[PDB]
């Protein structure tokens, strides 16, 4: 069955607004919630498709993807998802899936943060289990080379250059832990020297935030220009060698960036072009092997599988 943005138009016409209201309220106390939620959707989609598998807690028949490298002590916003689900279950009992709810949340988070607005295709259902081993192998790492980032995306069906470059724009807001850039700052690639593609003046600033013996969990803004605004500032930074993580700067400085550089240049000088590409990439990502029809279920509680 094909996903459609009109899926809940009759069964729960107000799910969108309920989701938005929840985020709007949380934003007051947590300015970063919008970035965390968009990332939860991405982490979900890349492991067995967008089926809300990342939301499941540990059970005795399978381990949680929340423990996966990249997710453990990194992913967040779960109790917020719990709140959205409860509000929606009240208005529309057993109607909206966690997988679809997380998809709308990601979209509203982008819009609320100043990004484009669009109706995401819906109709996805929830998985009956989590896949930790798959997560540990399918999620791209910050130390990946351009070709490795490409293999990683092609692996789940996103075999276009615009997919990698456009979705990477998700790093236009949010934070990153010092621990993930330490090598770029003090000993890159076992050379005892910092990454040569890192702006030297910016390297000073970064070394100040992430001292060699400091707190590895200290957070740093992904986008030094507009840290919380969803815009194309992320691509401008790359052009100045100010991409925060290796996988970031590689889109512009890697010797394999022949096909990505033109897209960086383009997105950096046109918000409309970037937003179009982002919406198109997002919908494509939201379409990775989804459960539909009778497959999977509609979780009452996103943290656990329905007993029946």
Ligand X SMILES: O=C(NO)c1ccccc1
Minimum CB separation of residue 130 from Ca ion in Å reads 8
Nearer to ligand HEM, 144 or 186 (CB): 144
Minimum CB separation of residue 3 from ligand HEM in Å reads 18
Which residues have C-beta within 8 Å of that of residue 60, sequence separation ≥ 6?
none
Q: List the alpha helices (DSSP H) in the chain.
A: 15-29, 33-45, 78-91, 98-112, 132-138, 146-154, 161-168, 182-186, 200-209, 233-239, 246-253, 261-269, 271-285
- Rounded Cα distance between 273 and 208, Å, is 35
The site for Ca ion (CB under 5 A) is made up of 44, 47-48, 51, 53, 172, 223, 226, 229, 231, 233
Nearer to ligand HEM, 19 or 35 (CB): 35
**Residue 139 is a binding residue for ligand X (CB under 6 A):** yes
Which residues have C-beta within 8 Å of that of residue 249, sequence separation ≥ 6?
195, 197, 198, 238, 241, 243
The site for ligand HEM (CB under 6 A) is made up of 32, 35-36, 38-39, 42, 74, 76, 140-142, 144, 149, 167-168, 170-171, 173-177, 180, 245, 247
Residue 26 site contact among ligand HEM, Ca ion, ligand X, none (CB < 5 to 8 Å, cut-off depends on kind):
none
From 77, 140, 169, 170, residue interacting with ligand X (rule: CB under 6 A): 140
Please report the sign of the dihedral spanned by the C-alpha atoms of residue 52, residue 53, residue 59, residue 60: positive
Quick check: 8 and 298 in contact, CB under 8 A? no
**Residue 174 is a binding residue for ligand X (CB under 6 A):** no
Nearer to ligand X, 102 or 305 (CB): 102
Instruction: Name where the chain breaks: residue before each gap, C-N > 2.5 Å.
Output: none
Nearer to ligand X, 7 or 180 (CB): 180
Minimum CB separation of residue 94 from ligand X in Å reads 31
Among the residue ranges 59-67, 109-117, 133-141, 192-200, the one whose residues contact ligand X (CB under 6 A): 133-141
């Amino acid at each position: 069955m094909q996903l459609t943005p009109t899926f809940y138009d009759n069964s729960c016409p107000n799910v969108s607004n309920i989701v938005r209201d929840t985020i709007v309220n949380e934003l007051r106390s947590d300015p970063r919630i919008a970035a965390s939620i968009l990332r939860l959707h991405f982490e979900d989609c890349f492991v067995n498709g967008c089926d809300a598998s990342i939301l499941l807690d540990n059970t005795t028949s399978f381990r949680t993807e929340k423990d996966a490298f990249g997710n453990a002590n990194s992913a967040r916003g779960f109790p917020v998802i719990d709140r959205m689900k409860a509000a929606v279950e009240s208005a529309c009992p057993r109607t909206v899936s966690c997988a679809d709810l997380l998809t709308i949340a990601a979209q509203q988070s982008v819009t609320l943060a100043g990004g484009p607005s669009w109706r995401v295709p819906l109709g996805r259902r929830d998985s009956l289990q989590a896949f930790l081993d798959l997560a540990n192998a399918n999620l791209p790492a910050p130390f990946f080379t351009l070709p490795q980032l490409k293999d990683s995306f092609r692996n789940v069906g996103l075999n276009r250059s615009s997919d990698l470059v456009a979705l990477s724009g998700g790093h236009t807001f949010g934070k990153n832990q010092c621990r993930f850039i330490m090598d770029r700052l003090y000993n890159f690639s076992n050379t005892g020297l910092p990454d040569p593609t890192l702006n030297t003046t910016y390297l000073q600033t970064l070394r100040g935030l992430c001292p060699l013996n400091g707190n590895l969990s200290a957070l740093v803004d992904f986008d030094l220009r507009t840290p919380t605004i969803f815009d194309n500032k992320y691509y401008v930074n790359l052009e100045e060698q100010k991409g925060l993580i290796q996988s970031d700067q590689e889109l512009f400085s890697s010797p394999n960036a022949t096909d990505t550089i033109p897209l960086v240049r383009s997105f950096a000088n046109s918000t409309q072009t970037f937003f179009n590409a982002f919406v198109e990439a997002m919908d494509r990502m939201g379409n990775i092997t989804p459960l539909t029809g009778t497959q999977g279920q509609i979780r009452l509680n996103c943290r656990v599988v329905n007993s029946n």
